Symmetry: C5
Subunit: 311 residues, 5 copies
């Protein structure tokens, strides 16, 4: 078994199609996702042509090892791909129709800058190395590129599954490569993040600000230190769900900024008490009275600025 | 080996039956469950017929590769479903009786809206792609569809295992597909949720309300902030056992609402102290006196409204 | 290859023997355990009989695929059995001696009612489906059922490994089935639970009771709320090591009851302070004096009652 | 393929050699470790004797299935027969030189009594069951038993890799078994345990003892209760890294003992306050003055005793 | 199939080349990383030579088992290397061009001394054991050693992928071995460590130092003990991301040192109160006044010293 010869010097066009059956396990930390799909290949092998009449059939079936199959590989698969062939059909002129059912753990990077409001473009790269006799080029048969209606990704909205029709042509180890880009467009379902992380995080911060309506140092220290600890718990919880990025994520920025607010509240609480002990509650009163407006205003403005910078 | 010819233009009916041997590992976060079962296939292959009077043997045994077997696949499976063929029996008439023992990690979505009081309908979809020569259609032999009595799914009650008898016949990639729906009806054993999460969560909330019977700001801040922290621990613990949903779960709603109660208890505690310092304990006394009745009443009513909206 | 014919209409007796090599990974949450053992099968195949004299040898070695081997399957195994044939020997008269080395992740339910003082009966069910020519029945050769002396289970005491000699006989999907029951009797090593969970849990509760020798509301609130939080930590830690049961476990009951003791100490602490503020320390003194004896006595009685109900 | 004939009643000697390439993943909880090594087997098969002149080669090479290979099995593994034959060399006399690369998850119990100062003796047991025709006995070729210099075990010091030269010959299920014991001697690198667990644990305990220089009940309750909670965190963290033992580990004993110190510190703090309220600060003063010396002294002695009992 | 004979007594040179397709899962605790790459082998087999003109084809293709392939094996790999042969090409002169696509979990130790500012040199060791007929030696074809532009390692910067050109030739078990060192140079992206661990850790420490501007013992005990607990949380969080080293890591040193600062702050807070009670607030005032300057200064000095010692 060896590649089909070119009539002229033409390259061999393998028509591809990925049809998603299942989407699952989008792992944020690992930047991987698992897929269950149909891979369809179609090419011209003249050596396998036949006359419909003298055969008694309009189409012929084959076993994988009986005929030449192009070595289509996945560029970005974590766990060594396992594939079982479902059908091989040969039409009169020698057109092969390959159909396999595969499943792989695809590794595609994610952009966490707008987390948890972010949207992602997942990739599946098909590749084919050209052989000694002739060159192999990939093409997309848009007719066999889809995803079923049932397909759901847990915690994500599946927008589209398209393929970049023009393959990327290049050389690797003095050999011609044909690479294709299948793109899964998804957007994160941020709903749950609101009552589970964002709102509890805001509540504990507002609770900390009640120290602005209290003259009790011992109570203020308990209010501010306690809420700060609860904020550390939320910070830790958030950072366990995410990988370590070389940039600031939106949630990350908000969380980091809230530390500054706790820190300044501590300073204020400290200052107010210090002045009170030094017998000048009048200066302490005015700093506390300002704080009651200042913190909410500055917090709100800081957030407006951040949202602007990030969106 | 190739499909049996139709006498007429008729499609081939493959009779299916799934008999559950074991149910295990219902993972809520992943929305998967593992199964260990018997798959039985039965169809008409005229090429394998024989006379019963002359043959001597009433039933003929075969090895898988010796005869044509229809490619029955599972739609919603994760881990490759290993299959061990246990027996192949041919009727003298030509009827085939296939029996395999399989095991798979099945991926079926779950509805967490009523958690931990929810009930689920797990699916196992069988599929068969039609071949070149003739079309294949699936059917249910209710006689070979069951589950053994021993079958238990840890933390769940197994209600029923039925199959939707009418297959979903549709065209995919210019070929006809026959899909069958086996349904496992299960309901969650909520018992453990009561003394482990629900009651401790209520106790800490009631402990927080004792601040309505004390004039000590320092003690009230310790009561309300501490219990609030313990409530965050329960919230975190609960949300780790569940996937991120684009909707509110029942437990989620209760938990979120309790934050509002803590927040308002802080405001009250703050107000009471502020008035006390301002030398008007009379207004503070009446706000506190109201709070005792108000809090339990409103909490109770709120719960009734929520349980109503959810059930 | 097909089953040996009955001289008469008699069923075929397959003699089974399991010798445990290793026991490991008893997973409480999953209710599974892993095993490494020898499986021995022995049956009469008349077709391979011989005369010890003319054949030249009294023993005859064989390869698996060369002769008919009965399809002995494991019922309750999660991880798809992988079997290595170590030896196949044929006696002159035609008796076969099969010996395989297997390893499986066995799924067997556990009774957590007396946890961590519980004892368990783990099961390994061998099964054999009868074929169309003749019926197959299982039997135990007590001579080949054991476990080596080195066999240990981490955190458990291995009491006995016996097999129920009389096999179950039943019909499944119109064919006869022979199931056996191998039983591994184990008891939990509760030792570590005493200084790691039980004693720290008791200490924090006794620490909570020192509030009965204090008139300081602010100190009492700190004592009772703090220890209650530490009790939540122990509760959470315990419930992570166990699956969600539809019943109350012993540890579970004790833990749940201790919440009531915290709750009532809060009420007491609240009452004492309230009376003190209302200028009646005499009533408060007598309530606190009573609590000093009541709390320990009631706790002790409650425990005796529980231990009685559970053991 | 069948075993070599005994030229006389003599058993067959298979010479073994394990050469460690990699050591990794010593899992304390599971009591397992993973290994990557060379297994070398060498025995005499006279049936494979040849003439270097006639066959035109000084050494013959073979494929595994072409010749008889003794079934050498690993006793204490979970690994499930992973490997690759690197070479098979047969010299003219019939000496076979088998060399395979293997990797396994060996399961060997650990002694946690002196943790984290403990040393362990890991085992790899090779076994061979004797066949029908003749008996097989194992032997160690000390020349082929080693470990490369690069071999490192994360968090452990590798002392020696020797093999017990005399095999353990015994009877199992009516056949002769030859067992070999390869021993990996390792000692735990306790360094990290000092600044991560031991010193922070001592610091929080000493912090608790400052309550012996304070007359403030509210401050003492905060000191002792808080540090006790931090001690629970360390206890939990430690017990997650260890399996549940039926004995007391060194760390376990220290940790358990520190609970008694917290408990008695609470009693003291309680007593001191009670006396103060009762208007006898003189008795309280003498109890607190004693406590300062008492606690350090007793703690120190208790530790001298434990280190003595354990080492 | 056997090794090609030397014209002279010369050793056989196998030219190697590793071309990284993907880098993923650098596990700090396990000291492993996963790789997806091309392995290219090239050697001279005179037995496969032929005429370019008379033969008619310039290059001839072969299947793996048809020709002799040198047994090139990876030293430091965990999961069995999965090899998919992509192409085998023979030059007319008899040179072979092997190209496989492999993926492995590589075990390479890491230096945590400068964590999280550390840089690592990952290794991939290729090895070849010489055979009985002739010796095999490895060499690097720098032309086929690279990594694609897309290659990214999450949380790391990929510096370079070079190979040490001179093989390490040594004797192991009487046969000669040729080992090659491919080196992946990477540096850790420390960015995220700054707002997630380092800055929150500094903030809580500065918050603890406000006790130097307070005379309230009860508030100081709450400030210092609370922040100390938050520091333990950060310590625990950090040590879960790292393996147990026999040395001090940079972060480890900083973290350990901060415990000393908390401890001395406790002593100060204790001293100040003790003096206040003893009616000497003048000595207490001067100790706190000194502490206000000493703590920040000594902290700043100590850090400079540490960074010096570590960088
Ligand atoms: C704090 C709030 C405590 C939560 C109380 C239970 C909520 C609820 O509503 O529980 C209700 C569910 C059952 O509902 P179902 O029959 O499955 O729904 C179908 C209902 N239709 C058909 C009308 C739509 O639980 C029970 O059997 C009640 C026992 C749980 C009591 C726990 C007390 C604490
Ligand atoms: C509190 C103390 C915080 C620790 C601060 C970084 C310590 C250090 O030393 O940071 C230094 C490292 C880089 O070191 P390098 O170039 O790889 O070493 C080369 C050593 N030679 C010459 C011996 C080979 O980080 C930086 O680029 C600094 C940015 C991080 C600042 C974090 C501020 C908070
Ligand atoms: Cl392919
Ligand atoms: Cl099938
Ligand atoms: Cl079997
Ligand atoms: Cl072997
Ligand atoms: Cl190779
Ligand atoms: Na082919
Ligand atoms: Na407090
Ligand atoms: Na063999
Ligand atoms: Na070969």
């Amino acid at each position: 078994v060896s590649p089909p010869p070119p009539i002229a010097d033409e390259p061999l066009t393998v028509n591809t199609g990925i049809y998603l059956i299942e989407c699952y396990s989008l792992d944020d930390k690992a930047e991987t996702f698992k897929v269950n799909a149909f891979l369809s290949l179609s090419w011209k092998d003249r050596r396998l042509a036949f006359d419909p009449v003298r055969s008694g059939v309009r189409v012929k079936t084959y076993e994988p090892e009986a005929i030449w199959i192009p070595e289509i590989r996945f560029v970005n698969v974590e766990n060594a791909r396992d594939a079982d062939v479902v059908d091989i059909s040969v039409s009169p002129d020698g057109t092969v129709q390959y159909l396999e059912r595969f499943s792989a753990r695809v590794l595609s990077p994610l952009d966490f800058r707008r987390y948890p409001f972010d949207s992602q473009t997942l990739h599946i790269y098909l590749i084919v190395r050209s052989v000694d006799t002739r060159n192999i080029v990939l093409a997309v048969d848009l007719e066999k590129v889809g995803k079923n209606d049932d397909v759901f990704l847990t915690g994500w909205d599946i927008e589209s599954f398209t393929a970049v029709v023009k393959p990327a042509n290049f050389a690797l180890e003095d050999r011609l490569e044909s690479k294709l880009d299948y793109q899964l467009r998804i957007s994160r379902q941020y709903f749950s993040y609101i009552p589970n992380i964002i709102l509890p995080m805001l509540f504990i911060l507002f609770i900390s600000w009640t120290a602005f309506w209290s003259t009790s140092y011992e109570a203020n220290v308990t209010l501010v230190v306690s809420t700060l600890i609860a904020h550390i718990a939320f910070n830790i919880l958030v950072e366990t769900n995410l990988p370590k990025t070389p940039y600031m994520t939106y949630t990350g920025a908000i969380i980091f900024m809230i530390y500054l607010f706790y820190f300044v509240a501590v300073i204020e609480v400290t200052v107010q008490h210090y002045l009170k002990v030094e017998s000048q509650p009048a200066r302490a009163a005015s700093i506390t009275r300002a704080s009651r407006i200042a913190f909410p205003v500055v917090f709100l403005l800081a957030n407006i600025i951040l949202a602007f910078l990030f969106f």
